[PDB]
């Protein structure tokens, strides 16, 4: 089905300690493909996936140059929002931005996006019409006027509906063996008695790509989020991801308690029960 | 490929 390309940008200011940090990172689905960190040696955009080093010198030079302008808008934005919010200079403050685009299973344009946060809360985002802004506060409005008179949205729409989707597919078919794979979960179940009265059943799901998975626990008939302990989906660090879900069972009822696994690599949604 | 035209807030 769907694919996406998303770029995440983080700029954090360092009072008394000079220039802000800037990290940018490029994803296609849940695969990191490029990075730039203001701290690392090179001071270029560097590759992070094998299917992208086959881009030539002119890709690398350009990427590096735009990631610096990104760096520079951010560097200035730190002191602009310090200004807007009349904040003290002695405080470290965070700016994040992510833009990107979704495409469907024909690879044609679905959704495009561009949000901005200042200290971890929405500042202004591009609406889904790619025409109009959502300033979160009253300082933030000044940016909205600035961006409306600088025709920002129009340049962004052009990118999101064009260059963003044109490049996603270039990436998607360069890394055909990597990105268009779907990796089935290696399903698994453990049983550990806590005291003498209770026991914990744990549905494991390992070695899957992509990171979209849902595991729901369920007794007898209808389901349960009244006893679900779910961990956040975590990377194994080899491209695949991991998740568990658990329950506090009254003992003897483990026959009618059932686990439910949904994914993209699972044709029929699999169902296990402790045996 | 990054956006070409970022603007200050």
């Amino acid at each position, epitope marked *: 089905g769907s694919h996406s390309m998303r770029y995440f940008f983080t700029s954090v200011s360092r009072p008394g300690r000079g220039e802000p940090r800037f990290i940018a990172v490029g994803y296609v689905d849940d695969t990191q493909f490029v990075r730039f960190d203001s701290d690392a040696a090179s001071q270029r955009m560097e590759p992070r996936a094998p299917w992208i080093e086959q881009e030539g010198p*002119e*890709y690398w030079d*350009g990427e590096t*140059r*735009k990631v*610096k*302008a990104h760096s*520079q*808008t951010h560097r*200035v934005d730190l002191g602009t929002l310090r200004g807007y919010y009349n904040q003290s200079e002695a405080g470290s403050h965070t700016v994040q931005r992510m833009y990107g685009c979704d495409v469907g299973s024909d690879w044609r344009f679905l959704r495009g996006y561009h949000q901005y946060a200042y200290d971890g809360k929405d500042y202004i985002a591009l609406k889904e019409d790619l025409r109009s802004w959502t300033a979160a506060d009253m300082a933030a409005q000044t940016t909205k006027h*600035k961006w409306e*008179a*600088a*025709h*920002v949205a*129009e*340049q962004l729409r*052009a*990118y999101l*509906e*064009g*260059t963003c989707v*044109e*490049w996603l597919r270039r990436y998607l078919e360069n890394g055909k063996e990597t990105l268009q794979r779907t990796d089935a979960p290696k399903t698994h179940m453990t049983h550990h008695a806590v005291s003498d009265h209770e026991a914990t059943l744990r549905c494991w799901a390992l070695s899957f790509y992509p990171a979209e998975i849902t595991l729901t626990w369920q007794r007898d008939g209808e389901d349960q989020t009244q006893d679900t302990e779910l961990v956040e989906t975590r990377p194994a660090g080899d491209g695949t991801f991991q998740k568990w879900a658990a329950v506090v069972v009254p003992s003897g009822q483990e026959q009618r308690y059932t686990c439910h696994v949904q994914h993209e690599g699972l044709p029929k949604p699999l169902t296990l029960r402790w045996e | *490929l*990054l956006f*070409g*035209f*970022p*603007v*200050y807030v």
Partner: T-cell receptor, first 116, second 110 residues
Framework: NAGVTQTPKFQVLKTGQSMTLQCAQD?????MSWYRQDPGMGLRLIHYSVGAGITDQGEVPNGYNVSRSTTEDFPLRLLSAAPSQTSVYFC??????????????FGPGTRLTVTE | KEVEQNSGPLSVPEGAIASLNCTYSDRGSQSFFWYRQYSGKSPELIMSIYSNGDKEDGRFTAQLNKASQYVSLLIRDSQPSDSATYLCAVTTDSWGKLQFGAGTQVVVTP
């Protein structure tokens, strides 16, 4: 309204002479650019500056020094004039990081003749 | 020769369409421009186009095909005051140098 102004329109220099062409820009742009233009190679980049304070060289840097103390003004000096500097010189301004539409604008030009 | 544009001169009479072409070589280019330079003066921007398809503005119509890397400009219904040379220019980003083509000279005969 102004756009991109540049004095002078026309200039004769002898060989060795110093002259500084001036250029200015109302519209609050960050990215300015001197460019010479000639019959054999169209436009060539001399020097450019992507903000106030900072400047870098182009494809024909050589012979021409540049500075940018303000956002507005980007003067090009030719320290020792040479007959190979006989051209039409074009100021050219571009918004850069400050805002509004990728469009680059152009000064009306300085025709310069350098004779021995 | 990063932006190869149409050679010249291109002679058309009044009423004719004077199609111009330019091809470019950086794949990751993002804005595309047509300028107009009457002999003796300065290039003047007439058409900016930013994404695939046609952009209309009176008598001009620019086209963009990023897939085959081609920017066009057709001048519907010519005046004799369209006699100039028309420079195609292409850029990658806010800070990447604007790449001018050489110029195609257009002569509208009366």
């Amino acid at each position: 309204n102004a756009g991109v102004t540049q004095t002078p329109k026309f200039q004769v220099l002898k060989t060795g002479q110093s002259m500084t062409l001036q250029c200015a820009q109302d519209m609050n742009h960050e990215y300015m650019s001197w460019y010479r233009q000639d019959p054999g190679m169209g436009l060539r980049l001399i020097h450019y500056s992507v903000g106030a304070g900072i400047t870098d060289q182009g494809e024909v840097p050589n012979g021409y020094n540049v500075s940018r103390s303000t956002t507005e003004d980007f003067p090009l000096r030719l320290l020792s004039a040479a007959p190979s500097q006989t051209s039409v010189y074009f100021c050219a301004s571009r918004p850069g990081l400050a805002g509004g539409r990728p469009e680059q604008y152009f000064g009306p030009g300085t025709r310069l003749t350098v004779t021995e | 020769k990063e932006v190869e544009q149409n050679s010249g001169p291109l002679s058309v009479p009044e009423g004719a369409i004077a199609s111009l072409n330019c091809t470019y070589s950086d794949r990751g280019s993002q804005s595309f421009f047509w300028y107009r330079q009457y002999s003796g003066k300065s290039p003047e921007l007439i058409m900016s186009i930013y994404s695939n398809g046609d952009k209309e503005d009176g008598r001009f119509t620019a086209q963009l095909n990023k897939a085959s890397q081609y920017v066009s400009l057709l001048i519907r219904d010519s005046q004799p005051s369209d006699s100039a040379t028309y420079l195609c220019a292409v850029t990658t980003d806010s800070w990447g140098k604007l790449q001018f083509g050489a110029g195609t000279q257009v002569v509208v005969t009366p």
